[PDB]
Amino acid sequence: MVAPITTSGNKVLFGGQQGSIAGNSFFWSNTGWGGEKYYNAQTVAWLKSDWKSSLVRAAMGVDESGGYITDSYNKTRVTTVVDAAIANNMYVIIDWHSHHAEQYQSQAIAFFKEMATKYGNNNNVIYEIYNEPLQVSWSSVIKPYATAVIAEIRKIDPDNLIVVGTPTWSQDVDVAANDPITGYANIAYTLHFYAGTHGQSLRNKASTALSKGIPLFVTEWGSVNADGGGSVATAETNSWVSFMKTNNISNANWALNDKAEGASALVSGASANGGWTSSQLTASGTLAKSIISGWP
């Protein structure tokens, strides 16, 4: 039903043609952290019908407090959002939302094997296997774990996109480009930016990476500071959108959530049933709807 996603050189393709999609990341799924109330079919359908979103990202907390490693119901929140994205003809990222993914390798393999088995025949699904590595080695920390998890997914789901986290909160895509994962089909690399913190020096590294032949996917970006706080950087966000559209870079905005921080798209109390009007969107949410609604 939706077009299958593939990669070829530095391009992420849809039904074999260049293009890109825009949508939304939910906040951490973790029990007690307040983003869980939006993991439901009404909010998913509303992002589709009112924001024209093409994509939702289920950000399943792993080793953080209330994450999947101690609270099994995180997986239920993910499957609820996956089923709803399929029901609404939207792509969906299943995101192992950890800063230490290599330390939970067997758990990550088991989880992605169960997902690939249940969902691997749907074109909608994208596997994101390591949200945000920290200041750790690409060759000696991330790449060996990413290779192990990809080997296992590809034995079950030969095709659907896998997106791999990069060093330094998924900034160092130019490092991954110097030592890419070869031999497996349809693998892209994560770039995260926050417009209040990151500008031209980070676009320069993304340009280097694309020049060296690797495809990028922005599974998370914000218009505020990297810690999720602060003011919307409208002009810097525009420069990033220009860069993403130039290079057909798909993207998910952080976060569809109503916590009292700058990155939250919604004003606190915004209904979990969706139906939000203009005043229930924060400065960041207003700008993200504009970008997503206008995406080519």
Residue numbers in the entry: 1 to 296
Paper text:
Here, we report a novel cellulase belonging to GH5 family, named as CelE1, retrieved from a sugarcane soil metagenomic library, which is a promising biocatalyst in biofuels production. CelE1 is 1284 bp long and encodes a polypeptide of 428 amino acid residues containing a putative N-terminal signal peptide followed by a glycoside hydrolase domain belonging to family 5 (GH5). Cellulases or endoglucanases (EC 3.2.1.4) catalyze the cleavage of random internal β-1,4-glycosidic bonds in cellulosic chains and can be found coupled to the cellulosome or generally secreted as independent enzymes. A new plant cell wall-degrading enzyme with ability to breakdown complex cellulose-based substrates was isolated and characterized from sugarcane soil metagenome. This enzyme was shown to be an endo-acting glucanase with high catalytic activity at a broad temperature range and under alkaline conditions that usually cause enzyme inactivation of classical acidic cellulases.
The structure of this novel cellulase 5 was determined by X-ray crystallography at 1.8 Å resolution. The crystals belonged to the monoclinic space group P21 with two molecules in the asymmetric unit, which could suggest a quaternary arrangement. However, analysis of crystalline contacts using the PDBePISA server did not indicate the presence of any stable protein–protein interface discarding the existence of CelE1 as a dimer in solution. The enzyme displays a canonical (β/α)8-barrel fold (also known as TIM-barrel) characteristic for members of GH5 family, which is composed by eight β-sheets surrounded by eight α-helices. The long loops connecting the C-terminal end of β-strands with the N-termini of the external layer of helices delineate the negatively charged catalytic cleft. By comparison with other cellulases the residues Glu152 and Glu240 were identified as the catalytic acidic residues, where Glu152 is the proton donor and Glu240 the nucleophile. These residues are separated by a distance of 6.1 Å, compatible for a retaining catalytic mechanism. Other important residues for catalysis are conserved including His117 and His212 and the aromatic gatekeepers Trp189 and Trp241. Despite the fully conserved catalytic cleft, some significant structural differences were found in the interfacial loops that vary in length and composition. Moreover, its crystal structure was determined at 1.8 Å resolution indicating that the 8-residue-long insertion in the β8-α8 loop might confer higher conformational stability in comparison to its psychrophilic orthologs.
